[PDB]
Amino acid sequence: SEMGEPIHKLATRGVLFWKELDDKIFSLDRSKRVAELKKRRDYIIKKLNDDFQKVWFGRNSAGEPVDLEDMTYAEVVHRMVELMYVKHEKRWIDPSLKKLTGDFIRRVEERFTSVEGQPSLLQNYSDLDEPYPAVDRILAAYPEASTQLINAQDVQHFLLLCQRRGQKPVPFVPALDENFEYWFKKDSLWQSEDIEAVYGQDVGRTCILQGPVAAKYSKVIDEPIKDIL
Amino acid sequence: LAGGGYYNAQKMSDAISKIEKAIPPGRGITVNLIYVNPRAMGWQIPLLGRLRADGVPIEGLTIGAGVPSIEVANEYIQTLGIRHISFKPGSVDAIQQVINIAKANPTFPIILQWTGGRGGGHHSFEDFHQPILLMYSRIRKCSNIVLVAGSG
Amino acid sequence: TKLRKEIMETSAIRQAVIKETAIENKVVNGEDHEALYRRVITEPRANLK
Amino acid sequence: DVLDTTAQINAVINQDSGKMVEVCGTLKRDGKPVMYVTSQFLYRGVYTDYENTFQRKDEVPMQLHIATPQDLAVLRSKEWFKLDDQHDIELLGQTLVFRLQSLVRFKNKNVYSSVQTIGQVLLELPTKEIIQVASVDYEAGESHGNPVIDYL
Amino acid sequence: EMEAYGKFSLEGCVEMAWMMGLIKNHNGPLKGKPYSGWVDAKTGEPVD
Amino acid sequence: IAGNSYSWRHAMFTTEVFVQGHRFQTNPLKRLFAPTRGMYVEITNPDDPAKTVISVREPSQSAKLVKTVEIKLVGDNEIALTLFEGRTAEGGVVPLTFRFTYHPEAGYAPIREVMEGRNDRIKEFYYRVWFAEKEVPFDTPLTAVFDGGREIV
């Protein structure tokens, strides 16, 4: 578990890879951890991208997986939206994550403005309600934001934003750092209760808890509980 | 009511007083608090206790993952006005704990929910049978205990 | 000296009134409301292309 | 003595302890008021009947000193400040007395649903005359404070 | 920047101030609350 | 006072939780029927449920035991919890009563309380006990000024 405790989960694709890391990564002392993550980086990145609750926040404009550090400012603001706002339901997974994406936007603004006085194109986070429409407009007023990658400083900033107190844990993985554990297995249940949120929306990569023996004793779905009892 | 999904004091006293109003008048509510989360469980307990004093229909408390200390339970019992208290032990000695908690208050309802190794999520390494097969006698010899089989 | 006064005087009044009516809004609407509705001017940073 | 007992409800607001009522009594004798017996009562418990909560306070007598055309220009620039057609005594040098009354209606114990302030702006002449140079009229709903009192 | 324009851009200041050792990048807690970005080398404080 | 018969009289002295709306409340009979220096408790028509009547008598201040509490039925299930206060505005024992439904349907909370009017009903009581007038100015606006009347000291 998060706390390090044993758990019984529906041995999904995700939960299986999670077990793998329990043994290959979370098995090693805090220190030697980062080292091993770098030797199996792209292997852990495939397994992330393919079948886990949380994806690798790494993709570029052309849909291919890259390093967070190789992303453009645009691609990042966009990828944040992609992974925290469910298109076909027109909702954010949580108002906080909207604020997140909104803040970083503001940041990308500041990075690309160089005279005082000019106000923000995102003056109220009410705009990100219907995001994908209005976001492109803001990103538009800052041309180069699509030309050049994240300033190494801003990467660090981004990463501290995904950890701030009073925010739903990020719905993905920002990098294989010293906190790769927190990134990976923090807040893993919620996704079983709302699979419309999940990447691709398959349970295949989700945490559903079950006894080993009470799994046979369930055969019909959607039975009223008044009945079962 | 799984209290372990209520991070905010407001959202818990909220969804709790939504239940009071959609219930067979007279029914009691039972909240389930996680013991290895003493941070969140810090506000949760005096929250329940405070609610009950206003009339809110909570007459049942359940402490999961870890068995409180004898005087830790004694507070819960005689502070928040609950009618029954439910512990989830997981080891042979965890049981004996509960028993003493019971001998502590020989006038109080103590639902001894017994779980086995094959439970969902957080699970001991114990077998269902041999712990109970070993303790049953002593458990019974305390009247306050409601031995409730669970798991599998 | 007359002209000196009138000019300084009217501007003083004008910008004083503004501060007044600005304060009035923080009272009536509350810190939170008035705060969250102010033009957010971005502070420049430097990117080394 | 023969005493005529008159009373009215100066405020009923629901604090946390319970709900409270302020009773202002006036004992009159020979047509003339002799002593006001105010009093507060507590219907103790939990209340959310904010639709009928309200208060008539007598705002603290306050002393505003106009000293600059800047000062005066603001005291006139106010919406709630209504100067009178008595005399055009330059309000410049002198100071003014603001004895106000007000009525507030609650909604949240934190946020006034609606507030009204009426008062009299006084000036004392060199001769010791007291004139109503103006008066105060302000009212708004959904207010967090009293913008008139604040200015003062 | 100097030879041509005659003074330092904000971009230039930060570059000089970096190599002169007046500011160094910090990334971790600073007086409790976390923080990243430029910091005054002398006074451990942050700098905009 | 509950007896062995599963009656309403047994549930009144058993359940410490009286349901009111969606709230629990401490069984007031616990405080009422707590032992006293010389209290009397009678159970008329004991084994005849619908006709059983429970009454209490405690010593007055310097006087012989007086009627204090009574419980009986009315309109089927509506139980009448009644209190009798001697000294009043009219020199006569005025009664205050709380009404309770009783649905042995639900064994956990066999007793509920009749809510509607409780406020008004009780206010009426006081009014009668303070000024001896049973008719109590409800609809009078709070803007209203209130007359206490002429008075000679």
PDB file of N, CA, C and O in Angstrom, chain F residues 35 47 60 72 87 111 147:
ATOM      1  N   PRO F  35     -35.176   7.934  41.349  1.00  0.00           N
ATOM      2  CA  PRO F  35     -35.554   7.850  42.767  1.00  0.00           C
ATOM      3  C   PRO F  35     -35.505   9.191  43.516  1.00  0.00           C
ATOM      4  O   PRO F  35     -34.611  10.012  43.306  1.00  0.00           O
ATOM      5  N   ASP F  47     -52.098  -4.864  33.524  1.00  0.00           N
ATOM      6  CA  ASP F  47     -51.928  -5.829  32.430  1.00  0.00           C
ATOM      7  C   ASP F  47     -52.874  -5.593  31.255  1.00  0.00           C
ATOM      8  O   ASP F  47     -52.861  -6.344  30.264  1.00  0.00           O
ATOM      9  N   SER F  60     -44.789  17.758  48.369  1.00  0.00           N
ATOM     10  CA  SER F  60     -44.679  19.194  48.130  1.00  0.00           C
ATOM     11  C   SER F  60     -43.717  19.800  49.133  1.00  0.00           C
ATOM     12  O   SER F  60     -43.315  19.140  50.095  1.00  0.00           O
ATOM     13  N   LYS F  72     -50.769   8.075  29.886  1.00  0.00           N
ATOM     14  CA  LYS F  72     -51.903   7.269  29.451  1.00  0.00           C
ATOM     15  C   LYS F  72     -51.919   7.280  27.928  1.00  0.00           C
ATOM     16  O   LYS F  72     -51.029   7.865  27.307  1.00  0.00           O
ATOM     17  N   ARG F  87     -48.199  25.662  41.826  1.00  0.00           N
ATOM     18  CA  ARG F  87     -48.208  27.127  41.895  1.00  0.00           C
ATOM     19  C   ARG F  87     -48.176  27.764  40.509  1.00  0.00           C
ATOM     20  O   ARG F  87     -47.195  27.623  39.770  1.00  0.00           O
ATOM     21  N   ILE F 111     -40.631   4.219  20.109  1.00  0.00           N
ATOM     22  CA  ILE F 111     -41.257   5.482  20.480  1.00  0.00           C
ATOM     23  C   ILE F 111     -40.728   6.663  19.664  1.00  0.00           C
ATOM     24  O   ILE F 111     -39.519   6.787  19.444  1.00  0.00           O
ATOM     25  N   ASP F 147     -48.329  45.965  25.079  1.00  0.00           N
ATOM     26  CA  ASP F 147     -48.922  46.617  26.233  1.00  0.00           C
ATOM     27  C   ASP F 147     -48.885  45.690  27.431  1.00  0.00           C
ATOM     28  O   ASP F 147     -49.333  44.546  27.355  1.00  0.00           O
TER      29      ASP F 147
END
